[PDB]
Symmetry: D2
Subunit: 238 residues, 4 copies
């Protein structure tokens, strides 16, 4: 049996147990600021990611076991103009050596908008801009090896409000669940889908966040993570 | 700081750390069988509850602190005829000395269908029968001192399928959240509302389940809880 | 699988999740005051106990499994005259219906100084007075169904200093371990012994503290518990 | 507030969340084999280490806070001839970029046998061979920036038996405690000392194990770690 856990109720400057990639910085208020802010305004064409330093043991081929996990986090998206919000934020699992990919609507996750099994990516996206591949309206999506979500639900961005997210994986039913609550307005969202982690991901992954602002100067927003917990449990074989 | 936790991934016969009330028994398959089954068929007019034996310290007037909590459980409702399903199951918090009340549509929670602040009850109901006070259709409800829910959402009973529920309370925003997932069909539900526990409940409560079958012979269903976890955390003051 | 946990970093007045027996009260400073204090002085012939309200599932005859557990606590003994310290404090496991027994050197645990398997008691004692059955000197003892310890080590009371205790049980080796540290003086103690819980205790027990002051007016001390954690884990069968 | 935890009840081959250094391999039985074995016999002059991949946040200069931690592990030392056992095993904390140093009696920890504050090492050693700097007999030691222990206790190696170790740090008293129990013989050992982590270590460290076999062919033993848990808690400022 193997377990991994961590909790951040806020972030310290120079967090050496996180891999910060692209534009990510830690604010003096203790937030993970994924996309650039200059003079209190979000900067366009910005991309930042943050991963937990330790690989997570997500499944084991020898024992044929798959881990359960649960992660919770709080985030804020602040768009100067809500109608022009772009592009969004995702929580994701990827190979240990994962590096930022294309900015904008590809969210730093993918090199292009096609499906490719060598991506080895599972993500939950909070998507604020309708790309050509997207459903109508802002939405939450479960993504497997593609920016084109396997399943989506409508989600109304509550501009500059704290969103509380829980994402969990139940290995026995191969079910990934994602929920988002805005306590400020008592609004909540949930979706779930079958995602076979053993078939999609390598045995060890890194986990974390990615976010991207829009590729034009009037389509911008901030993407801050305020707090993050993670727990994974790889059981003994039956 | 005070915390309480417990986990049951299944139930043992004669569980001395649960207070079983009314008809509740533990099955040899390890389920908490809240309402009676006879010859593999649910019995009408049955009511059973199960509470964790220890009082939970939910808030403290001296330090003016309120606990966070989270509970998860799995349950199954099996109705021979889904249209005639009655009456449902609830998770609840109540005074330490709480005893079963009226059966049927009052779910063992309330003496009548009126609102009364001396009840000191907060519940999340999974309501399978439309009483005169209910919305149209089966629904999940957040209940505060009344069988007449403060907030409801439509919920389609997936007959004899395992439902995974999470209910959490965030003290800082006074927000109660309840979610239900059916992994078998990838269907999910969530709602949340403001519930001020400090104003509704005494400082110590008992927590648990209640369920009731219908008060007529053709309006019956089973109500089994398969697993239950609970975690509460009453923080130090500021 | 079944687990039970709780944490008290201090105690609240009227703790409804503890069974207080004999003279025990909670002080306004948040301590569990097991033996009486009157006008800032310990009272002789006083006996108090405190148990967690919920029964703990320590083993299961159906699945033939035995729990691991670990408890930690901090305590203080303050004797006006250290040479006349009596009688001591114990952590213990006992049947759910356990009641205080004889005061003084029997520590509220036993009716007499003999061995009897119907006691169903396992205790770790911090023994400040040499009775006829005791080794020379103040000592820590592991007790099984008798005040006459199965195993003892010398322990020097550090008068009015905080002692940090950890007691753990490893089911697979039937080993009970107890350690005590005085951080103030960098002094530490440890002992362990084979104790077969399945053979000694019923399937469910209550756990807690007992303490007794001396049976003469010049042989007195206080016995305060400052903090307490407990975790038990009854595994699935192999 | 920041916490980090992990559990291994056994080890998988190619553990990508551990940094294996020197000779360390994972056995097919799931043990961390720190020093080499060839044809079932320990090889002399072997040195291996294993660190958790993620840096641990042990103190924070911004908030002026220091973490508590607790680690537990099980290990086995098997010497063909107990009188010729060498050299031993240690648990340690060191800079993130730590690399194996000198073999033999320096345990892979130090470049020489002198005290040097630039080492930035805190270790607990299980020392099986009397070097020129050592006390008489096999011993457990607390080491700060030197192979010459700050404090030692006698410890009798129980050849090829499982040792259960707990090492904990209490930031409020700056106290490091280490205990070892052999359940097989009911033998136990403990020591503790004041160690100011903020003054000795950098803000982030890596944690893990090191072990070395003797530098002559007749002074050899195996050093296997069977299981390992770690929990650290860096609190909010007070
Ligand atoms: C170590 O402690 C152990 C636990 O205390 C001791 O075992 C107890 O010993 C008790 C006697 O001291 C014994 O109590 C008696 O039980 C009789 C049988 O009870 C059951 O069976 C009946 C049907 O067959 C049924 O009617 C009963 O209701 C019970 O279910 C019972 O008849 C006795 O009651 C009569 O006799 C007494 C004495 O004259 C009267 O006072 C009483 O009113 C009645 O006329 C008696 O019962 C007890 O009476 C007093 C009351 O306060 C008690 O609550 C009530 O129980 C008890 O059953 C056992 N317990 C167990 C678990 O075995 C043990 O003593 C030794 O071992 C026991 C088993 C026994 O063999 C003793 O003779 C031994 O001394 C202690 N061991 C040692 C080595 O000292
Ligand atoms: C506390 O620990 C520190 C860190 O380890 C010690 O500092 C190191 O000491 C070692 C000595 O064992 C030094 O390594 C030797 O360095 C020489 C010189 O190399 C350089 O120059 C030559 C030619 O001049 C070039 O050929 C090289 O390419 C290189 O540029 C080398 O030839 C030897 O083979 C060793 O590798 C090491 O440099 C040094 N590091 C630092 C950061 O100072 C420190 O002890 C130090 O060294 C000793 C000998 C004394 O001089 C102390 O005053 C130094 O502090 C140690 N403190 C104590 C008291 O032991
Ligand atoms: C100004 C403008 O309209 N630029 C548009 C751009 O074409 C130009 C034109 C001139 C220059 N130039 O070097 O000045 C640079 C780029 O074509 C892009 C599509 O390929 C538009 O990118 C989209 O921007 C959106 C916000 O407007 C979202 O970020 C959306 O996700 C993103 N689409 C994707 C697939 O990433 C981008 O907005
Ligand atoms: C056959 C029949 O009419 N049965 C009906 C029953 O009637 C009688 C007849 C005589 C006596 N008496 O005091 O002797 C008492 C009751 O009165 C019950 C209400 O008071 C009906 O209960 C309702 O039954 C429904 C399923 O049919 C649901 O369970 C519903 O929740 C429940 N309503 C409530 C408020 O609990 C029940 O259907
Ligand atoms: C003043 C005095 O000496 N009182 C003594 C008291 O008195 C008597 C005197 C004669 C007879 N009798 O059989 O006729 C009966 C009782 O007998 C008590 C039982 O032996 C002494 O109790 C002991 O007191 C000690 C502190 O001084 C410790 O608390 C010690 O653990 C305690 N012993 C026990 C077993 O609890 C108690 O000290
Ligand atoms: C047979 C014998 O005496 N072998 C000894 C060896 O001897 C020689 C003699 C001449 C030359 N030379 O440079 O020609 C080289 C080696 O010198 C080693 C360094 O002092 C001895 O190392 C010690 O070995 C012990 C077990 O035998 C322990 O492992 C002990 O910790 C270890 N010492 C240290 C500091 O690591 C090693 O035992
Ligand atoms: C699928 O994704 C991976 C990385 O996520 C790419 O490396 C693959 O590109 C193909 O393989 C690489 C190594 C290189 O040879 C390239 O020329 C190939 O196209 C990518 N595959 C495709 C078809 O897009
Ligand atoms: C509100 O709830 C309390 C708690 O359950 C009830 O006891 C109240 O009923 C009234 O007071 C009780 C004690 C009893 O005297 C009864 O006859 C009264 O009706 C109830 N209050 C209401 C319905 O107004
Ligand atoms: Ca998009
Ligand atoms: Ca109803
Ligand atoms: Ca005594
Ligand atoms: Ca040595
Ligand atoms: Mn999308
Ligand atoms: Mn309803
Ligand atoms: Mn004693
Ligand atoms: Mn040594």
């Amino acid at each position: 049996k193997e377990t991994t856990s961590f909790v951040f109720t806020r972030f310290s400057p120079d967090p050496q147990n996180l891999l910060l990639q692209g534009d990510t910085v830690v604010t003096s208020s203790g937030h993970l600021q994924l996309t650039q802010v200059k003079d209190g305004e979000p900067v366009y064409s910005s991309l930042g990611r943050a991963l937990y330093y330790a690989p997570i043991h997500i499944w084991d081929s020898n024992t044929d076991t798959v881990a359960n996990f649960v992660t919770s986090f709080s985030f804020v998206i602040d768009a100067p103009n809500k109608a022009k919000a772009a592009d969004g934020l995702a929580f994701f699992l990827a190979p240990v050596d994962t590096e930022p990919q294309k900015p904008g609507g590809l969210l730093g996750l993918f090199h292009d908008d096609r499906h490719n099994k060598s991506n080895h990516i599972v993500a939950v996206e909070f998507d604020t801009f309708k790309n050509s591949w997207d459903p109508e309206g802002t939405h939450i999506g479960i993504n497997v090896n593609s920016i084109v979500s396997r399943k989506t639900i409508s989600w109304d961005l509550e501009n500059d409000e704290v969103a509380n997210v829980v994402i969990s994986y139940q290995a026995s039913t191969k079910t990934l669940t994602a929920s988002l609550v805005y306590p400020s307005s008592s609004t909540s969202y949930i979706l779930n889908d079958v995602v076979d982690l053993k078939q999609i991901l390598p045995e060890y992954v890194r986990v974390g966040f990615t976010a991207a602002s829009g590729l034009s100067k009037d389509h911008v927003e901030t993407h801050d993570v305020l707090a993050w917990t993670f727990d994974s449990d790889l059981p003994d074989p039956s």
